């Protein structure tokens, strides 16, 4: 019922001091795991208000296979601007690898479509995998992939997804990542004719930045509310979902906490 | 602490029955954690064939696509898949040592990782991937231990493996010992102590034809782990089988992989 907050508390109390690329100190643990039963509720956080619009649009953008911020801008989303070129380009980041992993043949692999196929025709496959960690291409990316690699699993007509995320800004970043992949899992399940199972979040370096400590204590003092419910309009292709096809119902968070 | 045996028990009791030719019990997203300071996680509840483990890893480090070097040393675990020339495709070690970049250049992920460990231990990008989406079809089969990350805190090197598919009875004992061993080498080459080895799996399964063997293993009292000693070397690529001594290994009898 509070996998994120449990993890957040554990790292707060138990994390090891560790210097960071950004010059801010962190407390961190390595190899941590959160598990959500999606059937019980949609894990958009209630102990602090999370901006779902940013989440949903970024995901739709990924599913386009889009390396340009343009389409995000058409929709008022600016979360990627900082890193873009004067043309708006970011290099072959997430979505580009999801939809268009360049194969030696000179062709391209749509990992999203490949996975949906497997889920429909061979649900017991243990190879239903999407990777964004394209070693040869990472240098051309504005940023190395963070949520790097994910797998699907099917049991009893329920779809599960496990994400491997190599680095996790537990306070500022992870709440978006959880919501994003949960959303992805609903979209995949709907398109594969399955229901939702578990979302499993597995992290590499899980850290609380030193300048978020007070914000974390605030958030940990709050009693979680019941989770909202996720609803999707009917579509016959994952690539046809729009922002308007998604509804987050009964989302009742505590107030947003702004970070320094 | 016996994370392996715990996991085995857990999957045996709560696993979902499934298909694939043999059926399995399956759980998804299971994690195991070993403090390498406390001992080398070479299983004591059955004799684990470490010879095959150690040689396989050394073979990986070589970047070798062909099984020749493994026969040279008596190891037959990869036979069932080789071509008549004994090639396997760009499996594990090819990806570790020479991931083909679009530039025509090859990336040595091992050296890159070692270099970060020496140069920038705080890095959260210290990763080796075998999951080369474009090359998987050329491989005799797709990678199981698909990729791994290193992490340093307080001079201690931890490693995390992501393994998409896990034969809990036959495969996982090797995967643990192999990545445990690789962490010791990396730590030594980097001037670090050993921290934790974290095993994270995808489809974690016991084959239906392994249940009796699994029960035998679980009735056995676990014994203290052995200790691993690595002779000195100047480079991770120069280690040899003889550099690797597992002291004080006192396992219960091996358990034959059924037919
Ligand atoms: O989807 C993301 C992307 C980034 N980060 C955080 C983790 C790190 O704190 C930082 C990126 O820093 P590096 O690990 O690359 O150094 O951003 C996330 O938490 N989730
Ligand atoms: O290092 C390895 C390699 C393979 N396997 C197992 C997992 C599966 O049972 C089988 C590979 O089959 P697929 O998941 O590819 O179907 O081998 C392991 O457990 N460890």
Coordinates of C-alpha atoms and ligand atoms in Angstrom, one line a residue:
Chain A
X1 CA 0.0 0.0 0.0
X2 CA 3.0 2.4 0.2
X3 CA 5.9 0.7 -1.7
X4 CA 7.3 4.1 -2.8
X5 CA 7.1 5.6 0.7
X6 CA 8.6 2.5 2.3
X7 CA 11.5 2.7 -0.1
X8 CA 11.8 6.4 0.4
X9 CA 11.9 6.0 4.1
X10 CA 14.4 3.0 3.9
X11 CA 16.9 5.1 1.9
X12 CA 16.4 8.1 4.2
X13 CA 17.2 6.1 7.3
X14 CA 19.7 3.7 5.8
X15 CA 21.3 5.2 2.7
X16 CA 25.0 5.7 2.6
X17 CA 26.5 9.2 2.0
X18 CA 27.7 9.4 -1.5
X19 CA 29.1 12.3 -3.7
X20 CA 27.4 12.8 -7.0
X21 CA 27.9 14.1 -10.6
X22 CA 25.9 17.2 -9.9
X23 CA 27.9 18.2 -6.8
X24 CA 24.9 17.8 -4.5
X25 CA 25.5 15.1 -2.0
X26 CA 23.2 12.1 -1.8
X27 CA 22.2 9.3 0.6
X28 CA 22.0 6.1 -1.5
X29 CA 21.3 2.4 -1.6
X30 CA 21.9 0.0 -4.5
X31 CA 19.6 -2.6 -5.9
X32 CA 16.2 -1.7 -4.4
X33 CA 12.8 -2.9 -5.5
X34 CA 9.2 -1.6 -5.3
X35 CA 6.2 -3.7 -6.2
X36 CA 2.6 -2.5 -7.1
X37 CA -0.6 -4.5 -7.8
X38 CA -2.0 -2.4 -10.5
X39 CA -5.4 -4.1 -10.0
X40 CA -5.6 -2.4 -6.6
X41 CA -5.1 1.1 -7.9
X42 CA -3.1 3.4 -10.1
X43 CA 0.1 4.4 -8.4
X44 CA 0.1 8.1 -9.0
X45 CA 1.2 9.3 -5.6
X46 CA -1.2 10.8 -3.1
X47 CA 1.3 11.8 -0.4
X48 CA 2.2 14.6 -2.8
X49 CA 0.5 15.8 -5.9
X50 CA 2.1 14.6 -9.1
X51 CA 1.5 16.4 -12.4
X52 CA 0.1 13.6 -14.6
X53 CA -0.1 15.7 -17.8
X54 CA 3.7 15.7 -18.1
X55 CA 3.7 12.0 -17.5
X56 CA 1.1 11.0 -20.1
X57 CA 2.4 13.3 -22.8
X58 CA 6.0 12.2 -22.4
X59 CA 4.8 8.6 -22.7
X60 CA 2.8 9.3 -25.9
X61 CA 5.8 11.1 -27.2
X62 CA 8.0 8.1 -26.6
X63 CA 5.5 5.9 -28.4
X64 CA 5.8 8.1 -31.5
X65 CA 9.5 7.2 -31.7
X66 CA 10.2 10.9 -31.6
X67 CA 13.6 12.5 -31.1
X68 CA 12.4 16.1 -31.4
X69 CA 10.7 18.2 -28.6
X70 CA 8.4 19.7 -31.2
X71 CA 5.4 17.5 -30.5
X72 CA 5.8 18.0 -26.8
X73 CA 5.8 21.7 -27.3
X74 CA 2.6 21.7 -29.3
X75 CA 1.2 20.4 -26.0
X76 CA 2.8 22.8 -23.5
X77 CA 5.2 20.2 -22.1
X78 CA 8.7 21.7 -21.6
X79 CA 10.3 19.0 -19.4
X80 CA 12.8 18.1 -22.2
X81 CA 13.7 21.6 -23.5
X82 CA 16.8 22.1 -21.4
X83 CA 18.6 19.4 -23.4
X84 CA 17.4 19.9 -26.9
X85 CA 19.4 21.4 -29.8
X86 CA 18.5 24.6 -31.7
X87 CA 16.5 22.3 -34.0
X88 CA 14.8 20.8 -31.0
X89 CA 16.7 17.5 -31.4
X90 CA 17.8 15.2 -28.6
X91 CA 19.5 12.3 -30.3
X92 CA 18.1 8.7 -30.5
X93 CA 16.7 8.7 -26.9
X94 CA 14.1 6.4 -25.4
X95 CA 11.3 6.4 -27.9
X96 CA 13.7 6.2 -30.8
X97 CA 15.1 3.0 -29.4
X98 CA 11.6 1.7 -28.5
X99 CA 10.2 2.1 -32.0
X100 CA 13.4 2.2 -34.1
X101 CA 16.4 0.3 -32.8
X102 CA 18.7 0.4 -35.8
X103 CA 19.8 -3.1 -36.8
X104 CA 23.0 -4.0 -38.7
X105 CA 20.9 -5.0 -41.7
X106 CA 20.2 -1.3 -42.1
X107 CA 16.6 -2.0 -41.0
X108 CA 14.9 -0.9 -37.8
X109 CA 13.3 -2.9 -35.0
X110 CA 10.0 -1.8 -33.4
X111 CA 10.4 -3.3 -29.9
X112 CA 7.0 -2.0 -28.9
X113 CA 5.2 -3.8 -31.8
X114 CA 7.4 -6.9 -31.3
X115 CA 6.3 -7.1 -27.6
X116 CA 2.6 -6.7 -28.4
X117 CA 3.0 -9.5 -30.9
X118 CA 4.6 -11.8 -28.4
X119 CA 1.9 -10.9 -25.8
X120 CA -0.9 -11.9 -28.3
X121 CA 0.7 -15.0 -29.8
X122 CA 3.2 -16.2 -27.2
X123 CA 2.3 -14.8 -23.8
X124 CA 4.5 -17.3 -21.9
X125 CA 7.6 -16.0 -23.7
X126 CA 10.4 -15.0 -21.4
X127 CA 11.8 -12.8 -24.0
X128 CA 9.2 -10.0 -24.1
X129 CA 11.7 -7.2 -23.6
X130 CA 12.2 -3.6 -24.5
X131 CA 15.6 -2.0 -24.2
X132 CA 16.7 1.6 -24.5
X133 CA 20.3 0.9 -23.6
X134 CA 21.8 1.0 -27.1
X135 CA 25.6 1.0 -26.3
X136 CA 26.7 2.2 -29.7
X137 CA 24.2 5.0 -29.7
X138 CA 24.3 6.4 -26.2
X139 CA 27.0 9.0 -27.0
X140 CA 24.7 10.6 -29.6
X141 CA 21.9 11.0 -27.0
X142 CA 21.4 14.2 -25.1
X143 CA 21.4 12.0 -21.9
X144 CA 22.2 8.4 -21.2
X145 CA 19.0 6.3 -20.7
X146 CA 17.8 6.2 -17.1
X147 CA 14.8 3.9 -17.2
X148 CA 16.8 1.6 -19.4
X149 CA 15.2 -1.7 -19.9
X150 CA 11.8 -3.4 -19.2
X151 CA 10.2 -6.8 -19.4
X152 CA 6.7 -8.1 -19.6
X153 CA 5.3 -11.3 -18.1
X154 CA 1.9 -13.0 -18.3
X155 CA 0.2 -15.1 -15.7
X156 CA -3.6 -15.9 -15.6
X157 CA -4.5 -13.3 -18.2
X158 CA -2.8 -10.6 -16.2
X159 CA 0.1 -8.6 -17.6
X160 CA 3.1 -7.7 -15.4
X161 CA 5.9 -5.3 -16.2
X162 CA 9.3 -5.0 -14.6
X163 CA 11.4 -1.9 -15.1
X164 CA 15.1 -1.7 -14.5
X165 CA 16.1 1.9 -13.8
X166 CA 19.8 2.5 -13.3
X167 CA 19.6 5.7 -11.4
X168 CA 16.8 7.1 -9.3
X169 CA 16.3 10.6 -7.9
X170 CA 13.9 9.1 -5.4
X171 CA 12.1 12.3 -4.5
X172 CA 11.9 14.2 -7.8
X173 CA 12.3 11.6 -10.5
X174 CA 10.8 8.2 -9.4
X175 CA 7.2 9.5 -8.9
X176 CA 7.1 10.2 -12.6
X177 CA 8.7 6.9 -13.6
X178 CA 6.3 4.9 -11.6
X179 CA 3.3 6.7 -13.1
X180 CA 4.8 6.4 -16.6
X181 CA 5.4 2.7 -16.6
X182 CA 2.1 2.0 -14.9
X183 CA 0.4 3.9 -17.7
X184 CA 2.4 2.0 -20.3
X185 CA 1.4 -1.3 -18.7
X186 CA -2.3 -0.4 -18.9
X187 CA -1.9 0.5 -22.6
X188 CA -0.1 -2.7 -23.3
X189 CA -2.5 -4.9 -21.4
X190 CA -5.6 -3.3 -23.1
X191 CA -4.0 -3.8 -26.5
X192 CA -3.0 -7.5 -25.8
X193 CA -6.4 -8.4 -24.5
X194 CA -5.2 -8.8 -20.9
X195 CA -5.8 -7.3 -17.5
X196 CA -3.2 -5.5 -15.4
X197 CA -1.0 -7.5 -13.0
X198 CA 2.0 -6.1 -11.1
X199 CA 4.4 -3.3 -11.8
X200 CA 7.8 -4.0 -10.5
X201 CA 10.3 -1.2 -10.1
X202 CA 14.0 -2.3 -9.7
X203 CA 16.6 0.4 -9.3
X204 CA 20.4 0.6 -9.5
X205 CA 21.6 3.7 -7.6
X206 CA 18.6 4.8 -5.5
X207 CA 19.4 8.1 -3.9
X208 CA 17.8 11.0 -2.0
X209 CA 19.6 14.3 -2.8
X210 CA 20.8 16.1 0.3
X211 CA 18.7 19.2 -0.6
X212 CA 15.5 17.2 -0.5
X213 CA 15.7 15.9 3.0
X214 CA 13.1 18.2 4.6
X215 CA 10.7 17.7 1.7
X216 CA 11.0 13.9 2.2
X217 CA 10.3 14.2 5.9
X218 CA 7.2 16.3 5.1
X219 CA 6.0 13.7 2.6
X220 CA 6.7 10.8 5.0
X221 CA 4.5 12.5 7.7
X222 CA 1.4 12.3 5.4
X223 CA -1.2 9.5 5.4
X224 CA -1.7 8.1 1.9
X225 CA -5.1 8.4 0.4
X226 CA -6.7 5.6 -1.7
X227 CA -5.2 5.3 -5.2
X228 CA -7.0 6.8 -8.2
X229 CA -8.4 4.6 -11.0
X230 CA -6.9 4.5 -14.5
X231 CA -9.4 4.5 -17.5
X232 CA -8.6 4.2 -21.2
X233 CA -10.9 4.9 -24.1
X234 CA -11.2 2.2 -26.8
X235 CA -8.5 2.1 -29.5
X236 CA -7.4 -0.7 -31.8
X237 CA -3.7 0.3 -31.7
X238 CA -1.4 1.5 -28.9
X239 CA 0.0 4.1 -31.4
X240 CA -3.5 5.7 -31.7
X241 CA -4.0 6.6 -28.0
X242 CA -4.2 10.3 -27.3
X243 CA -4.0 12.3 -24.2
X244 CA -7.8 12.6 -24.4
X245 CA -8.2 8.7 -24.2
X246 CA -6.8 8.7 -20.7
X247 CA -8.7 9.5 -17.5
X248 CA -7.3 9.5 -13.9
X249 CA -10.4 9.2 -11.8
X250 CA -10.6 10.1 -8.0
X251 CA -7.2 11.4 -7.7
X252 CA -7.1 13.0 -4.2
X253 CA -3.5 13.9 -3.4
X254 CA -2.0 16.0 -0.6
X255 CA -0.5 19.3 -1.8
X256 CA 2.4 19.5 -4.2
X257 CA 5.8 19.9 -2.5
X258 CA 8.1 22.2 -4.6
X259 CA 11.8 21.2 -4.5
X260 CA 14.7 23.6 -4.1
Chain B
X1 CA 21.7 -16.4 4.9
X2 CA 20.5 -18.6 2.0
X3 CA 18.7 -16.2 -0.5
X4 CA 18.9 -18.9 -3.2
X5 CA 17.2 -21.7 -1.2
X6 CA 14.7 -19.2 0.2
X7 CA 13.8 -18.2 -3.4
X8 CA 13.6 -21.8 -4.6
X9 CA 11.3 -22.6 -1.7
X10 CA 9.1 -19.6 -2.4
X11 CA 8.7 -20.4 -6.1
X12 CA 8.0 -24.0 -5.4
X13 CA 5.2 -23.1 -2.9
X14 CA 3.7 -20.0 -4.6
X15 CA 4.7 -20.3 -8.3
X16 CA 2.1 -20.3 -11.0
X17 CA 1.9 -23.4 -13.2
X18 CA 2.7 -22.6 -16.9
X19 CA 4.0 -23.8 -20.3
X20 CA 6.9 -23.4 -22.7
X21 CA 8.2 -28.1 -23.9
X22 CA 8.3 -28.8 -20.2
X23 CA 6.0 -27.0 -17.8
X24 CA 7.2 -24.7 -14.9
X25 CA 6.3 -23.0 -11.7
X26 CA 6.9 -19.3 -12.2
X27 CA 7.2 -16.1 -10.3
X28 CA 8.2 -12.8 -11.9
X29 CA 10.5 -10.1 -10.6
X30 CA 12.3 -11.9 -7.8
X31 CA 15.5 -10.5 -6.1
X32 CA 18.3 -12.1 -4.2
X33 CA 21.1 -10.4 -2.3
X34 CA 24.5 -11.7 -1.2
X35 CA 27.0 -9.9 1.0
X36 CA 30.2 -11.0 -0.7
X37 CA 32.2 -10.0 2.4
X38 CA 30.6 -12.8 4.3
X39 CA 31.7 -15.5 1.8
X40 CA 31.7 -16.7 -1.8
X41 CA 28.1 -17.7 -2.8
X42 CA 29.0 -21.0 -4.3
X43 CA 26.1 -23.2 -3.2
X44 CA 26.7 -25.7 -0.4
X45 CA 23.4 -27.5 -0.6
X46 CA 24.7 -29.3 -3.7
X47 CA 28.1 -29.6 -5.4
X48 CA 28.1 -26.9 -8.0
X49 CA 30.4 -27.6 -10.9
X50 CA 32.7 -24.6 -10.4
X51 CA 35.1 -25.6 -13.1
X52 CA 32.5 -25.0 -15.8
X53 CA 31.5 -21.7 -14.1
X54 CA 35.1 -20.3 -13.9
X55 CA 36.0 -21.4 -17.4
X56 CA 32.8 -20.0 -18.9
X57 CA 33.5 -16.6 -17.4
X58 CA 37.1 -16.6 -18.6
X59 CA 35.8 -17.5 -22.0
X60 CA 33.3 -14.5 -21.8
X61 CA 36.2 -12.1 -20.9
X62 CA 38.0 -13.3 -24.1
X63 CA 35.1 -12.1 -26.4
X64 CA 35.1 -15.5 -28.0
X65 CA 32.2 -16.6 -30.2
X66 CA 33.5 -20.1 -30.7
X67 CA 33.4 -23.0 -28.2
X68 CA 36.9 -24.2 -29.1
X69 CA 38.6 -22.7 -26.0
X70 CA 36.1 -24.4 -23.7
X71 CA 36.7 -27.9 -25.1
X72 CA 40.4 -27.2 -24.8
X73 CA 39.7 -27.1 -21.1
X74 CA 37.1 -29.9 -20.9
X75 CA 34.0 -27.8 -20.6
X76 CA 31.0 -29.1 -22.5
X77 CA 28.1 -26.9 -21.2
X78 CA 27.9 -25.0 -24.5
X79 CA 28.2 -28.0 -26.9
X80 CA 24.4 -28.5 -27.5
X81 CA 24.3 -25.1 -29.3
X82 CA 27.4 -24.7 -31.3
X83 CA 27.5 -25.0 -35.1
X84 CA 29.6 -27.7 -36.8
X85 CA 32.4 -25.1 -36.9
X86 CA 31.6 -24.5 -33.2
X87 CA 30.4 -21.0 -33.6
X88 CA 27.5 -19.5 -31.5
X89 CA 27.0 -16.0 -32.9
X90 CA 27.8 -12.8 -31.1
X91 CA 26.8 -14.1 -27.7
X92 CA 27.7 -12.7 -24.2
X93 CA 31.5 -12.1 -24.6
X94 CA 31.3 -10.7 -28.1
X95 CA 28.8 -8.1 -26.7
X96 CA 30.9 -7.5 -23.6
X97 CA 34.2 -7.1 -25.5
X98 CA 33.1 -5.7 -28.8
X99 CA 29.6 -4.3 -29.2
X100 CA 29.5 -3.1 -32.8
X101 CA 28.7 0.7 -32.9
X102 CA 27.1 2.2 -36.0
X103 CA 30.4 3.9 -36.4
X104 CA 32.1 0.6 -37.4
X105 CA 33.9 0.9 -34.1
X106 CA 33.6 -1.8 -31.5
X107 CA 32.9 -1.0 -27.8
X108 CA 34.7 -2.9 -25.1
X109 CA 32.2 -2.6 -22.3
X110 CA 34.4 -4.4 -19.8
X111 CA 37.3 -2.0 -20.1
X112 CA 34.9 1.0 -20.2
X113 CA 33.3 -0.3 -16.9
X114 CA 36.7 -0.9 -15.3
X115 CA 37.9 2.5 -16.3
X116 CA 34.8 4.2 -14.7
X117 CA 35.4 2.2 -11.6
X118 CA 39.0 3.6 -11.5
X119 CA 38.2 7.1 -12.7
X120 CA 34.7 7.9 -11.6
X121 CA 33.4 5.3 -9.0
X122 CA 30.4 7.5 -8.1
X123 CA 29.1 7.0 -11.6
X124 CA 25.6 5.6 -11.9
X125 CA 26.2 4.7 -15.6
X126 CA 28.5 1.7 -15.0
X127 CA 26.8 -0.9 -17.1
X128 CA 27.5 -3.8 -19.3
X129 CA 24.7 -5.0 -21.7
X130 CA 24.5 -8.2 -23.7
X131 CA 21.0 -7.4 -24.9
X132 CA 22.0 -6.1 -28.4
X133 CA 18.5 -5.9 -30.0
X134 CA 19.9 -6.0 -33.6
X135 CA 22.1 -9.0 -33.0
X136 CA 19.9 -11.4 -31.0
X137 CA 18.7 -13.3 -34.0
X138 CA 22.3 -14.2 -35.0
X139 CA 22.9 -15.7 -31.5
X140 CA 22.4 -19.5 -31.0
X141 CA 20.0 -18.2 -28.4
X142 CA 19.1 -14.9 -26.7
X143 CA 21.0 -13.7 -23.5
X144 CA 19.6 -14.7 -20.1
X145 CA 21.9 -12.8 -17.9
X146 CA 21.1 -9.8 -20.0
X147 CA 23.0 -7.1 -18.3
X148 CA 24.5 -5.7 -15.1
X149 CA 25.6 -2.5 -13.3
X150 CA 28.3 -1.7 -10.8
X151 CA 28.1 0.6 -7.9
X152 CA 30.7 1.9 -5.4
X153 CA 30.1 3.1 -1.9
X154 CA 32.8 3.4 0.9
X155 CA 35.3 1.6 -1.3
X156 CA 33.1 -1.4 -1.8
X157 CA 32.0 -2.6 -5.2
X158 CA 28.5 -4.0 -5.6
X159 CA 27.1 -5.6 -8.7
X160 CA 23.6 -6.1 -9.9
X161 CA 22.6 -8.6 -12.6
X162 CA 19.3 -8.5 -14.5
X163 CA 18.4 -11.9 -15.7
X164 CA 15.3 -12.1 -17.9
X165 CA 14.9 -15.9 -17.6
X166 CA 16.0 -18.1 -14.7
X167 CA 16.1 -21.9 -14.5
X168 CA 16.2 -21.9 -10.8
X169 CA 17.5 -25.4 -10.3
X170 CA 20.1 -25.7 -13.2
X171 CA 21.0 -22.2 -14.3
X172 CA 20.9 -19.8 -11.4
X173 CA 23.5 -21.6 -9.2
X174 CA 26.0 -20.9 -12.1
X175 CA 24.8 -17.3 -12.6
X176 CA 25.4 -16.4 -9.0
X177 CA 28.9 -18.0 -8.8
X178 CA 29.8 -16.5 -12.2
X179 CA 28.8 -12.9 -11.4
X180 CA 30.2 -13.2 -7.8
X181 CA 33.5 -14.2 -9.4
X182 CA 33.4 -11.4 -11.9
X183 CA 32.7 -8.9 -9.1
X184 CA 35.9 -10.1 -7.3
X185 CA 38.0 -9.6 -10.4
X186 CA 36.5 -6.1 -11.1
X187 CA 37.0 -5.1 -7.4
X188 CA 40.7 -6.4 -7.5
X189 CA 41.4 -4.7 -10.8
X190 CA 39.9 -1.5 -9.4
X191 CA 41.6 -1.6 -6.0
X192 CA 38.2 -2.0 -4.2
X193 CA 36.7 -4.4 -1.7
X194 CA 33.7 -6.5 -2.5
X195 CA 30.3 -5.3 -1.5
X196 CA 27.0 -6.9 -2.5
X197 CA 25.9 -9.0 -5.4
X198 CA 22.2 -8.4 -6.2
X199 CA 20.5 -10.9 -8.5
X200 CA 17.3 -9.6 -10.1
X201 CA 15.2 -12.0 -12.2
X202 CA 12.4 -11.8 -14.7
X203 CA 10.7 -15.1 -15.3
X204 CA 11.9 -17.2 -12.3
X205 CA 11.0 -20.8 -12.8
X206 CA 11.4 -24.4 -11.6
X207 CA 10.9 -27.0 -14.4
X208 CA 8.3 -29.6 -13.6
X209 CA 10.9 -32.3 -14.1
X210 CA 13.1 -30.8 -11.3
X211 CA 10.7 -30.9 -8.4
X212 CA 12.1 -34.0 -6.7
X213 CA 15.7 -32.7 -7.1
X214 CA 14.6 -29.4 -5.7
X215 CA 13.0 -31.1 -2.7
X216 CA 16.2 -33.1 -2.0
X217 CA 18.2 -29.9 -2.1
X218 CA 15.8 -28.2 0.3
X219 CA 16.0 -31.0 2.9
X220 CA 19.7 -30.3 3.2
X221 CA 21.1 -28.1 6.0
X222 CA 23.2 -25.3 4.5
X223 CA 26.9 -25.0 5.4
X224 CA 29.2 -22.0 5.6
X225 CA 30.3 -20.7 2.2
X226 CA 33.8 -21.1 0.9
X227 CA 36.2 -18.2 0.4
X228 CA 37.5 -17.0 -2.9
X229 CA 41.1 -16.1 -3.4
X230 CA 42.4 -14.4 -6.6
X231 CA 46.1 -14.5 -7.4
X232 CA 47.4 -11.0 -8.5
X233 CA 47.2 -9.8 -12.1
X234 CA 47.8 -6.6 -14.0
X235 CA 44.6 -6.9 -16.0
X236 CA 41.2 -8.5 -15.8
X237 CA 41.9 -10.2 -19.1
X238 CA 45.0 -12.0 -17.8
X239 CA 43.4 -14.0 -15.0
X240 CA 43.6 -17.8 -15.5
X241 CA 41.8 -20.8 -14.0
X242 CA 44.7 -21.4 -11.7
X243 CA 44.4 -17.9 -10.3
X244 CA 41.1 -18.8 -8.9
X245 CA 41.1 -20.8 -5.7
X246 CA 37.9 -21.6 -3.8
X247 CA 39.1 -22.4 -0.3
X248 CA 37.0 -24.5 2.2
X249 CA 34.3 -25.6 -0.1
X250 CA 32.4 -28.4 1.6
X251 CA 29.1 -29.0 -0.3
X252 CA 26.6 -31.8 -0.1
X253 CA 26.8 -34.3 -3.0
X254 CA 26.1 -33.1 -6.5
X255 CA 22.5 -33.5 -7.8
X256 CA 22.4 -34.9 -11.4
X257 CA 20.5 -32.8 -13.9
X258 CA 17.7 -35.3 -14.9
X259 CA 17.1 -36.4 -18.5
Ligands
LIG1 O1 13.8 9.1 -15.6 C1 14.6 9.6 -14.8 C2 15.7 10.3 -15.3 C3 16.6 10.8 -14.4 N1 16.5 10.6 -13.1 C4 17.4 11.1 -12.1 C5 18.4 10.1 -11.5 C6 19.7 10.9 -11.4 O2 19.6 11.6 -10.1 C7 19.6 12.0 -12.4 C8 20.4 11.6 -13.7 O3 21.8 11.6 -13.2 P1 22.8 10.5 -13.7 O4 22.5 9.1 -13.0 O5 22.8 10.2 -15.2 O6 24.2 11.0 -13.3 O7 18.2 12.1 -12.8 C9 15.4 9.8 -12.6 O8 15.3 9.6 -11.4 N2 14.4 9.4 -13.5
LIG2 O1 22.6 -18.4 -17.8 C1 21.5 -18.9 -17.9 C2 21.0 -19.3 -19.2 C3 19.8 -19.9 -19.4 N1 19.0 -20.1 -18.3 C4 17.7 -20.8 -18.5 C5 16.5 -19.9 -18.3 C6 15.5 -20.7 -19.2 O2 15.0 -21.8 -18.5 C7 16.4 -21.2 -20.3 C8 16.4 -20.2 -21.5 O3 15.2 -20.4 -22.1 P1 14.3 -19.1 -22.6 O4 13.9 -18.2 -21.5 O5 15.2 -18.4 -23.7 O6 13.1 -19.7 -23.2 O7 17.7 -21.4 -19.8 C9 19.4 -19.8 -17.0 O8 18.7 -20.0 -16.1 N2 20.7 -19.2 -16.9

